[PDB]
Each structure stands twice: as structure tokens, then as C-alpha cells.
UniProtKB/Swiss-Prot annotation:
Changing residue 18 to A: Decreased binding to RNAs. Changing residue 88 to A: Reduced binding to N6-methyladenosine (m6A)-containing RNAs. Reduced ability to undergo liquid-liquid phase separation. Changing residue 129 to A: Decreased binding to RNAs. The chain holds residues 408 to 548 of 579 of the full protein. This is YTH domain-containing family protein 2. Interacts with CNOT1; interaction is direct and promotes recruitment of the CCR4-NOT complex. Interacts with YTHDF3. Interacts with RIDA/HRSP12; interaction leads to recruitment of the ribonuclease P/MRP complex. The disordered regions have the ability to interact with each other and to 'phase separate' into liquid droplets within the cytosol following binding to mRNAs containing multiple m6A-modified residues. This leads to the partition of m6A-containing mRNAs into membraneless compartments, where mRNAs may be stored, degraded or used to transport mRNAs to dendritic arbors in neurons. Induction: Following heat shock stress. It comes from the Eukaryota. Ubiquitinated by the SCF(SKP2) complex, leading to its degradation. Residues 12-146 form the YTH domain. Highly expressed in induced pluripotent stem cells (iPSCs) and down-regulated during neural differentiation.
């Protein structure tokens, strides 16, 4: 057969999201919210705002050291920088934005480590920092593997 869904799209931007905390992942899935670092929030905010609803901003979530990605969410709002403090495991994050989780499933890094990022020194996508952006052609490949994995 054939799945040409992801291969056919031109307006979308995709970021890696890294979390020290499994609790933060669970809270994000439960309440459809996230918060990054100050520089990560700014990165995500500018991408969401310049997208102006013409395509999705996708977030590929992985807990540091866990060996897998744990799912996919779409950015659903700009960043509100002045929100209740301390709602995450550490009180290091300032602000909040809405997300919508699309896929909650564990995908081993082995499934994705062949895909490399030309904007990050050709390193495997699985070796990315928080809010590392993924070029769209590599992102289509990552999304297809994630959706296919069983």
C-alpha cells in the first residue's frame, strides 16, 4: 500500500520538546498545557505567531534519558508569560501555552535515530535539545514513523 499523507504539506513547523520530568508530561496530557524555558518559549511563540493559523506547530515530546519519545502535541495558543508559578515539578518555568496532544505513545529512539538534522550538525533527531527545530522534510519522516510504530 501507500501512505502519502505527510509527504504532501508545505506549511508546518515542528519542534523537539525535552522534559526532565515524567510528572510534567502527565500534567501536560491531563490539562493540555505546557511551558518551556524563557528562550524556548520565545522560540515557540515566534513560530506560532508567524504561522498565523496557516499550518500546525507540532511538538515532539521526550523525557531526558528515557530512550524514547512519548508523543506529539500541537501548539494551540501563543505564550502567556505571566501565569501562576510553581505548577510544574520545578519552579523554573514562567508562563503557559495551550497544546493539544495528538499521539500519546512510546516510540524508541532506535526507530528515529537514522533521521539527521542538517540544521543541527547532521546529528540524529533523537540527540536534540529542548525546542530544537526540525526541518519540515525531516519532520514529515519523523511523523510517519511515529504514526506507524506499533
Amino acid at each position: 500500500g501507500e501512505n502519502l499523507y505527510f509527504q504532501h504539506m508545505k506549511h508546518g513547523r515542528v519542534f523537539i520538546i525535552k522534559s526532565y520530568s515524567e510528572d510534567d508530561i502527565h500534567r501536560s496530557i491531563k490539562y493540555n498545557i505546557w511551558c518551556s524555558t524563557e528562550h524556548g518559549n520565545k522560540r515557540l511563540d515566534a513560530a506560532y505567531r508567524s504561522m498565523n493559523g496557516k499550518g500546525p506547530v507540532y511538538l515532539l515530546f521526550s523525557v531526558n534519558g528515557s530512550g524514547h519519545f512519548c508523543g506529539v502535541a500541537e501548539m494551540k495558543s501563543a505564550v502567556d508569560y505571566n501565569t501562576c508559578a510553581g505548577v510544574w515539578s520545578q519552579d523554573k518555568w514562567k508562563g503557559r501555552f495551550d497544546v493539544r496532544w495528538i499521539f500519546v505513545k512510546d516510540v524508541p529512539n532506535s526507530q528515529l535515530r537514522h533521521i539527521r538534522l542538517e540544521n543541527n550538525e547532521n546529528k540524529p533527531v533523537t540527540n536534540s535539545r529542548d525546542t530544537q527545530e526540525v526541518p519540515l522534510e525531516k519532520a514529515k519522516q519523523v511523523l510517519k514513523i511515529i504514526a506507524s510504530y506499533k
